[PDB]
Amino acid sequence: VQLVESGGGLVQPGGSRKLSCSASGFAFSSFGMHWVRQAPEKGLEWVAYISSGSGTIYYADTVKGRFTISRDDPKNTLFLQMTSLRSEDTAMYYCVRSIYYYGSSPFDFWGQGTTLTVSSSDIVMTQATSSVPVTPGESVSISCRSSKSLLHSNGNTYLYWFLQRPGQSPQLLIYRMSNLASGVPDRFSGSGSGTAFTLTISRLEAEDVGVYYCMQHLEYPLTFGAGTKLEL
Amino acid sequence: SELDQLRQEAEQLKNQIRDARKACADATLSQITNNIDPVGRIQMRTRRTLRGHLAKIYAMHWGTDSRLLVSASQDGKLIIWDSYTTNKVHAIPLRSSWVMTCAYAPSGNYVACGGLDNICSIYNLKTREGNVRVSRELAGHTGYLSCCRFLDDNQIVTSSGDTTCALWDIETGQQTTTFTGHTGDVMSLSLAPDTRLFVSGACDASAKLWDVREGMCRQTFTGHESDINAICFFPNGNAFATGSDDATCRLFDLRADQELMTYSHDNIICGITSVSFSKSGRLLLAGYDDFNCNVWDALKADRAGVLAGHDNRVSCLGVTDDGMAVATGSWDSFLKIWN
Amino acid sequence: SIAQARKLVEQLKMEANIDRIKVSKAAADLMAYCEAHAKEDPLLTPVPASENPFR
Amino acid sequence: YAXTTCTX
Amino acid sequence: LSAEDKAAVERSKMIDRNLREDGEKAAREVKLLLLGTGIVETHFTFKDLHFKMFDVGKKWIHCFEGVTAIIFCVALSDYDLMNRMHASMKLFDSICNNKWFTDTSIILFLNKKDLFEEKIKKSPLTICYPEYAGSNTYEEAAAYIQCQFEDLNKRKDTKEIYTHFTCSTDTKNVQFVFDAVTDVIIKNNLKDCGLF
Amino acid sequence: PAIPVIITAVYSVVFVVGLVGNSLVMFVIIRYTKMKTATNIYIFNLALADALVTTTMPFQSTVYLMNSWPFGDVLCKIVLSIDYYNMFTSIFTLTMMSVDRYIAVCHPVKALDFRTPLKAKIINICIWLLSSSVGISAIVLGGTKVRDVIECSLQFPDSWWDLFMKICVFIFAFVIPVLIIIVCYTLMILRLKSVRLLSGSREKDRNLRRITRLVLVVVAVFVVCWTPIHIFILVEALGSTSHSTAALSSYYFCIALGYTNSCLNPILYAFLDENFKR
């Protein structure tokens, strides 16, 4: 129930740093763990994944060969060792827990995030709409498109809807379509097929403002979209 | 003088009951279904085999999604399996290894087990912590717990070796209703599809139909000559079937208050450990002590008897709600899904 | 004892006065249910590959 | 045996 | 397979290795049934064998077909106190004539040796069991009781009845159970070799 | 005094019996019995080694038909290495079956921590590799030498290494397995003679007699099959020729006795096995 980040700060280019994340309040060894960036004015981007039991470790192509993700299970800690840093790597890093079985709810909890500044094929997920003005009490529809079909032969469509409030970590709303996450009110609904995807909010309230993101989980370089901003 | 009058009143009540039974029966079910198409042969096959263990497998249970399965074994393990992919979703250690029954909640959030410890343990599957935690330990039975069935995520019904059934609230932890009237150890329950009635079978060679929200025995069925080990409702909720140690299955009707069918054979004298119907009736699947499951035509005589692959006796068997699969657990530490 | 004898005198006296239908039309209703739902019984009519296939 | 060893 | 499907398979494999580790740990253990709410489980260890005694005291006997042995305890002095010996021999007949218990060994402890020795000097057996037709000495009456218990076994070619007498100032009362369990393990090993 | 073609009938009969028995054994372990026990792993490995011995004796038959080697040098090296390798692995699998049974009887508490299919796999892999050493050593040292005729032998430089090879084969192929099997089964039966649960009665004594009879059968088959072949080899390696003729021909029959072992291990370890009869 808690993921607290540490590290961060100002680092010279070509240097190295050691991001750490302390996990508490849940069975840490049973969870796969993810590192996800956010640029100072841009969207979310996936960096690294380590499985439960450290069997499978996957990286993004941007940070491959320079980043190393590890975990210390008996002391409940995730690690990201970043060597040969670049000016593209100035970002705020999030640690995400992710559980995997039949009917699970992955990417459910997000950490607070830690910021570092460095001084001076893949599925494309498209959100063609941004900066949508809106008043409370009105139904809102947010669209998302995918380069290839997200429907597997299992009958599952792996698209995930997250919300990021101002000054807050992303919060999982929808994990598979028409599967609402725990603690989410029953006015968010998800629909779509193949390429097309839609999140609808029936009776909009003032706490629903922020940026909405769609992510795919069909292939391992997990990709987000430039989210849609809902403001009053 | 009181004992003689009591015996006379009991004798005349039983005689009036038997006289009502005799006038109730005019034509048997065999005389009606003697002119319908017989089911020729069922050739079931083991599609999946869930393995990895050595301890004998006691009672199993299915999910309402016909996908997830729960099995209890003598090694103190409750394993929740995904039957499509053979993956084990969950492994739950038990405080007592002498588990005799298990149940899966209709919502899918809870499992239950119990046995020689006289406790019904309720485990939560959906926790923020990430692991399965014991929700409750229902205590109060003075004998071993033999069967448990969920009505919802609030109430459960249990049978025990103290000749007593119970209906519990799983938040307060207290017996809401206590069902008494059996003279032997009750070892089987079956809940009705509408969950307003249930039926139980005991060591007294008797089955009893109980009302849940009224707390009294509606009917008593006296069939078999031996201990009734298994019991199961018909899909329409108006009939039930019983398996016993006399190597005989029996189909009774609730409204007629009488026995209709006797599923017997002259090759083995092995008792019945488990019975279940199919989605439409017509297939009474009975597991025996002879390492085999026989498939009976519910309106006729034997049809398949085809479930032959099991090294030891079939301890348990269940049918999914969509009727696609039949899962049998035996004492060879193996679960097999048959279709 | 005396309390057990009193409860045996009390008894239930309610399973006798119930409404029983004939066995014939109960059996007819049972086989009518079997005939009505026979199309949606996968264990009666075989299927090529429904949910548990093989290689 | 001898010669001829053996083939084998 | 999808990404989440492969991660689920990895979780299943981890559960597999945990189950195998628990099974390897539990393969040493020996389960004994003590005869003579719920169960009373007592766990101890002797010579790299972990013994679990389940104190429980015809319907609950169907949950015990995999036990290594049955420790049947009899106090002899109940001959001098409804006779308890008749109930004991009826229970021994029930535990030996079971169809599913035709290969389970029984360790027969006969306690109260000093009390029976003290009570046999003044009270003879003819007041309770006059058909034995023997002497009133300690050894002859003890052998008569032991053979009367042992003759109740039918078809003594698969299982063996182990008769021991309780002792206090030693540890041989656990060594007898150790020897009987060793013989049971030897027979099970020959069963696993496909050679018995 | 001439037995020219009955030896070919013996080779054909041994071929048919060995192929049928081995095909039945791997049919059982493929279709019926799972590899979840160590004894199944040992039975399967012995059946595979016996079938691999079986594959080479038609080549022995065609050498013993007409006195030549109508195959290449690479085939000579392959056949020689396969022959030596499979003889060693069959012998070591019999020896390890004996040691496994001795451990199961005389060391019963430790057997629960030893008679694991993982450790059976480890022991089998070690046996296979420690025979692969001499298998590649026979790849590197084989060949053919022109005599007239062509022999399919081990090509030593210039010889004295031949005697050393025969002594090494006789020591690590006959003496050590016979003494290990004798000691293991002797101590096994001696321990089993003082077991209360397996002796005493009539049926229990019948079971002990049956076990001891099978033990003496398998040891006697091993000694009878592998004695005269090794004895004749060492006599010819430490003698001064002979009158040729039958003194060569019965040698062919001696070789047949070795293949007799491959005809009886499926019988003596699967047909007489208790788990395979159910």
Side-chain angles (χ1 to χ4, degrees), chain A, chain B residues 1-302 304-339, chain C, chain D, chain E residues 1-79 81 83 85-89 91-98 101-111 114-116 120 123-126 128-138 141-143 145-154 156-168 170-196, chain F residues 1-11 13-19 21-22 24-30 33-35 37-72 74-146 148-157 159-192 194-203 205 207-208 210-212 214-270 272-273 275-277:
Chain A
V1 305
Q2 261 186 357
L3 293 157
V4 174
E5 322 288 330
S6 75
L10 190 75
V11 61
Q12 284 294 318
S16 310
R17 216 148 177 87
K18 182 67 180 294
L19 294 191
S20 179
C21 172
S22 303
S24 83
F26 68 105
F28 172 70
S29 64
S30 309
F31 282 81
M33 300 292 306
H34 294 259
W35 276 107
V36 169
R37 293 179 292 174
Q38 190 166 23
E41 276 176 353
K42 304 188 196 171
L44 311 160
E45 65 183 1
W46 175 80
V47 164
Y49 162 66
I50 187 159
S51 71
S52 184
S54 308
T56 296
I57 295 170
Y58 280 166
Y59 295 94
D61 270 321
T62 300
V63 308
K64 197 175 296 186
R66 321 149 52 216
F67 282 20
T68 306
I69 172 174
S70 66
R71 59 201 300 182
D72 209 332
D73 272 318
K75 73 179 197 180
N76 267 23
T77 313
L78 201 73
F79 299 113
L80 189 68
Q81 172 74 59
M82 321 174 291
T83 74
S84 165
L85 283 174
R86 218 177 299 155
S87 173
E88 191 274 331
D89 280 0
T90 182
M92 184 177 177
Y93 279 66
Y94 294 109
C95 182
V96 191
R97 72 173 199 167
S98 187
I99 195 74
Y100 291 110
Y101 51 89
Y102 176 79
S104 68
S105 172
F107 279 79
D108 44 350
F109 196 79
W110 290 58
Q112 301 306 312
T114 176
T115 292
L116 73 164
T117 306
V118 181
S119 79
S120 306
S121 53
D122 301 359
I123 306 185
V124 173
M125 300 282 329
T126 304
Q127 309 202 9
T129 52
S130 66
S131 292
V132 173
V134 69
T135 176
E138 271 193 341
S139 70
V140 188
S141 279
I142 297 143
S143 66
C144 184
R145 307 282 105 87
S146 181
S147 82
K148 87 176 277 192
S149 189
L150 287 185
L151 182 62
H152 205 254
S153 50
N154 300 117
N156 287 341
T157 305
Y158 308 93
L159 187 147
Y160 289 66
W161 281 107
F162 309 93
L163 159 72
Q164 178 165 44
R165 298 186 170 95
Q168 276 201 359
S169 279
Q171 163 201 11
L172 172 75
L173 303 172
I174 304 286
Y175 48 98
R176 200 255 177 188
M177 294 183 287
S178 292
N179 309 143
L180 193 65
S182 179
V184 193
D186 210 358
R187 50 193 208 260
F188 299 91
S189 296
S191 82
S193 282
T195 298
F197 294 99
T198 300
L199 173 84
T200 186
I201 318 163
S202 291
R203 299 284 175 272
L204 196 82
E205 292 180 353
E207 284 89 11
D208 291 331
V209 300
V211 193
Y212 288 81
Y213 291 96
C214 49
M215 188 205 82
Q216 66 98 35
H217 214 302
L218 189 77
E219 297 179 23
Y220 279 116
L222 314 170
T223 48
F224 293 85
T228 303
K229 189 172 174 196
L230 264 63
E231 71 253 30
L232 298 183
Chain B
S1 66
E2 191 186 7
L3 192 146
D4 292 352
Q5 289 155 350
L6 265 167
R7 197 166 60 198
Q8 194 258 328
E9 209 271 327
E11 198 260 332
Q12 72 100 30
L13 192 146
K14 277 194 289 197
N15 214 7
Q16 199 263 331
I17 282 295
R18 194 248 307 272
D19 286 339
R21 294 294 201 280
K22 276 197 289 184
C24 177
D26 275 283
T28 56
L29 175 52
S30 64
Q31 268 170 289
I32 317 292
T33 49
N34 50 358
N35 289 325
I36 62 170
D37 310 329
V39 179
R41 277 179 184 91
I42 315 302
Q43 191 55 235
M44 302 270 189
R45 280 173 192 273
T46 62
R47 314 298 203 198
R48 280 74 178 272
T49 298
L50 320 177
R51 64 177 67 250
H53 310 78
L54 297 168
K56 71 190 64 193
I57 289 180
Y58 271 36
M60 61 79 70
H61 202 231
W62 270 107
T64 57
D65 58 342
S66 309
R67 178 83 183 249
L68 288 187
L69 199 155
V70 60
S71 51
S73 189
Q74 210 63 252
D75 47 21
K77 280 308 184 289
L78 260 183
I79 305 194
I80 297 186
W81 318 75
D82 178 31
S83 71
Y84 283 20
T85 73
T86 301
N87 288 307
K88 325 163 158 55
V89 185
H90 285 111
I92 307 147
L94 313 179
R95 281 189 210 77
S96 187
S97 66
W98 308 101
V99 54
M100 293 177 70
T101 180
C102 73
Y104 183 76
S107 63
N109 318 311
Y110 294 88
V111 285
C113 56
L116 260 66
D117 62 358
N118 307 0
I119 316 294
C120 196
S121 291
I122 313 292
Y123 307 77
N124 195 3
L125 305 178
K126 271 89 158 177
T127 57
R128 281 295 295 270
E129 187 72 26
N131 45 13
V132 171
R133 181 72 270 172
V134 177
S135 296
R136 200 145 299 280
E137 297 103 355
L138 298 167
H141 273 306
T142 54
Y144 64 94
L145 195 143
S146 48
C147 202
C148 60
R149 282 301 174 255
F150 273 100
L151 279 77
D152 49 24
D153 281 345
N154 192 30
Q155 324 174 288
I156 209 172
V157 57
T158 48
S159 69
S160 164
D162 59 349
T163 77
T164 300
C165 294
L167 172 78
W168 313 72
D169 184 336
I170 69 160
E171 268 80 1
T172 300
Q174 301 312 302
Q175 280 178 67
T176 303
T177 313
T178 300
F179 309 92
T180 56
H182 275 302
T183 62
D185 310 330
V186 62
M187 64 183 73
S188 66
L189 294 174
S190 199
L191 259 180
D194 47 330
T195 72
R196 298 284 283 271
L197 294 174
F198 72 98
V199 72
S200 88
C203 276
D204 62 358
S206 163
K208 273 173 178 288
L209 175 77
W210 312 91
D211 203 294
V212 181
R213 75 279 190 191
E214 282 191 315
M216 48 191 200
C217 173
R218 279 187 176 270
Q219 270 151 24
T220 300
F221 298 89
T222 42
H224 311 262
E225 314 175 354
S226 66
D227 292 331
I228 296 181
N229 309 93
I231 198 163
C232 184
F233 264 102
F234 208 82
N236 75 332
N238 296 115
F240 66 100
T242 43
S244 177
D245 287 329
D246 51 14
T248 290
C249 280
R250 274 198 176 75
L251 188 147
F252 302 86
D253 209 298
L254 282 71
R255 297 179 299 183
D257 212 10
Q258 213 176 345
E259 171 208 319
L260 282 71
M261 294 299 291
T262 312
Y263 310 82
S264 301
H265 45 277
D266 44 358
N267 63 6
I268 54 159
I269 319 297
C270 290
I272 297 89
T273 70
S274 49
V275 289
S276 66
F277 274 105
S278 291
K279 202 174 178 51
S280 65
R282 294 289 289 166
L283 276 80
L284 184 60
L285 283 81
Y288 293 81
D289 270 339
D290 75 327
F291 309 159
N292 280 41
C293 190
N294 291 282
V295 174
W296 296 88
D297 199 296
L299 310 190
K300 293 182 183 293
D302 199 352
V306 75
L307 283 80
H310 266 308
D311 285 331
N312 210 345
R313 51 177 269 177
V314 184
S315 45
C316 48
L317 60 86
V319 175
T320 79
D321 291 331
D322 59 351
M324 295 296 172
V326 171
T328 63
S330 45
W331 282 340
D332 50 7
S333 82
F334 284 145
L335 294 174
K336 301 182 182 257
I337 295 91
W338 306 68
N339 195 358
Chain C
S1 74
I2 176 65
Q4 201 264 329
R6 183 180 63 83
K7 95 181 293 181
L8 196 66
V9 167
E10 201 262 324
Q11 212 47 51
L12 59 85
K13 267 88 169 173
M14 65 179 288
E15 292 165 13
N17 59 6
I18 71 159
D19 204 5
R20 304 181 164 84
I21 62 170
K22 213 164 167 282
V23 179
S24 289
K25 70 99 171 179
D29 186 32
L30 191 66
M31 65 179 288
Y33 188 88
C34 279
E35 183 178 1
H37 291 57
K39 262 200 200 209
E40 48 183 0
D41 202 351
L43 303 167
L44 274 165
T45 66
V47 288
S50 182
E51 66 183 2
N52 289 297
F54 79 107
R55 203 255 303 273
Chain D
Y1 122 83
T4 97
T5 56
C6 238
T7 98
Chain E
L1 281 187
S2 80
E4 298 191 13
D5 281 26
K6 293 187 286 185
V9 170
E10 188 163 332
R11 178 189 167 93
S12 196
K13 291 269 189 64
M14 280 184 68
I15 289 157
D16 289 330
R17 72 178 66 251
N18 271 341
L19 284 162
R20 195 179 73 244
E21 190 276 331
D22 277 303
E24 293 179 353
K25 173 172 171 239
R28 158 151 311 150
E29 264 154 1
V30 159
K31 290 166 170 195
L32 307 168
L33 181 56
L34 192 145
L35 302 183
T37 59
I39 63 159
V40 180
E41 183 178 1
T42 315
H43 173 87
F44 69 99
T45 300
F46 203 80
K47 291 179 72 68
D48 294 331
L49 268 176
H50 285 247
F51 295 92
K52 293 182 183 293
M53 290 198 179
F54 311 100
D55 198 11
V56 71
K58 271 184 180 182
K59 201 37 84 174
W60 56 92
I61 193 66
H62 86 282
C63 284
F64 286 114
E65 274 90 1
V67 298
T68 299
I70 302 163
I71 301 178
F72 203 85
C73 280
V74 165
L76 296 178
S77 73
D78 300 346
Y79 85 102
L81 301 173
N83 197 10
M85 294 298 102
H86 283 191
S88 291
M89 61 79 71
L91 204 49
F92 182 76
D93 279 326
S94 72
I95 211 67
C96 292
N97 284 274
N98 197 280
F101 275 62
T102 58
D103 44 355
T104 300
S105 78
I106 300 186
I107 295 90
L108 183 63
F109 272 101
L110 317 163
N111 215 342
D114 291 341
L115 206 55
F116 153 74
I120 211 64
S123 177
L125 291 171
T126 179
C128 302
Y129 203 74
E131 51 251 37
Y132 78 118
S135 75
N136 215 18
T137 51
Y138 169 73
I145 289 294
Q146 171 181 326
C147 71
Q148 205 259 327
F149 267 110
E150 271 183 331
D151 276 343
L152 260 60
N153 197 6
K154 312 299 198 195
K156 196 180 168 178
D157 53 353
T158 303
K159 77 184 182 182
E160 207 274 333
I161 302 299
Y162 295 78
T163 61
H164 311 293
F165 296 86
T166 55
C167 289
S168 290
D170 43 351
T171 63
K172 95 174 179 163
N173 50 5
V174 190
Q175 214 81 32
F176 282 144
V177 178
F178 177 73
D179 293 353
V181 160
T182 298
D183 284 331
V184 170
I185 287 173
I186 281 175
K187 196 193 170 177
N188 289 330
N189 287 347
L190 272 72
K191 206 164 289 203
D192 204 6
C193 285
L195 177 68
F196 169 66
Chain F
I3 320 289
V5 296
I6 320 183
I7 62 170
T8 55
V10 162
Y11 286 149
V13 161
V14 163
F15 192 48
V16 168
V17 164
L19 274 190
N22 289 284
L24 195 52
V25 167
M26 301 76 72
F27 199 61
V28 161
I29 318 173
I30 283 299
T33 315
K34 183 62 65 68
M35 283 73 74
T37 61
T39 186
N40 289 146
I41 301 175
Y42 285 121
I43 286 166
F44 171 61
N45 280 295
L46 190 61
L48 200 57
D50 282 316
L52 270 179
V53 167
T54 298
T55 48
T56 77
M57 64 182 179
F59 296 152
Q60 213 66 71
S61 163
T62 198
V63 175
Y64 295 172
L65 269 169
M66 61 80 71
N67 292 318
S68 73
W69 172 253
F71 307 96
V74 54
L75 281 72
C76 189
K77 294 192 171 226
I78 281 170
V79 161
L80 259 66
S81 303
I82 277 175
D83 214 355
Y84 278 58
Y85 184 71
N86 298 149
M87 157 175 91
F88 281 161
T89 50
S90 176
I91 279 157
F92 290 156
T93 307
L94 296 166
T95 296
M96 189 40 51
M97 283 201 163
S98 74
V99 177
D100 170 67
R101 284 148 163 197
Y102 164 81
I103 279 172
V105 180
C106 300
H107 296 253
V109 194
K110 300 294 187 291
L112 307 167
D113 310 298
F114 209 93
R115 278 182 94 231
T116 303
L118 191 139
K119 276 177 202 75
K121 280 158 193 144
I122 284 181
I123 293 173
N124 272 288
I125 285 300
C126 279
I127 287 182
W128 279 125
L129 286 182
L130 276 296
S131 296
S132 198
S133 177
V134 73
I136 69 166
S137 281
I139 296 296
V140 71
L141 183 63
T144 51
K145 180 151 179 206
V146 191
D148 302 328
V149 294
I150 301 299
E151 62 182 1
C152 189
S153 81
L154 298 152
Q155 286 315 297
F156 306 106
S159 189
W160 68 269
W161 281 94
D162 211 0
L163 273 297
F164 180 72
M165 185 64 72
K166 309 214 163 73
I167 300 299
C168 195
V169 160
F170 182 74
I171 286 298
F172 269 88
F174 186 70
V175 164
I176 301 299
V178 159
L179 281 71
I180 287 179
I181 280 175
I182 280 288
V183 163
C184 282
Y185 285 166
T186 300
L187 296 191
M188 184 210 169
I189 295 298
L190 278 181
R191 168 65 199 113
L192 268 192
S194 69
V195 173
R196 289 175 58 86
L197 186 62
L198 189 151
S199 69
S201 173
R202 295 181 185 174
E203 287 89 3
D205 213 7
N207 295 333
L208 188 138
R210 186 244 191 187
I211 285 155
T212 318
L214 190 149
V215 171
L216 276 296
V217 161
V218 292
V219 179
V221 175
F222 191 83
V223 176
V224 159
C225 278
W226 294 107
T227 295
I229 190 167
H230 287 244
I231 289 299
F232 182 76
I233 277 161
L234 274 296
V235 163
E236 291 303 319
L238 282 167
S240 50
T241 70
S242 288
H243 54 274
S244 296
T245 73
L248 190 136
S249 76
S250 65
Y251 153 74
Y252 292 178
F253 160 74
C254 277
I255 302 298
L257 282 193
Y259 299 122
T260 300
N261 206 284
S262 181
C263 279
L264 298 190
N265 293 7
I267 309 181
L268 291 178
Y269 293 99
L272 305 183
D273 186 77
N275 285 117
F276 279 166
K277 284 195 289 289

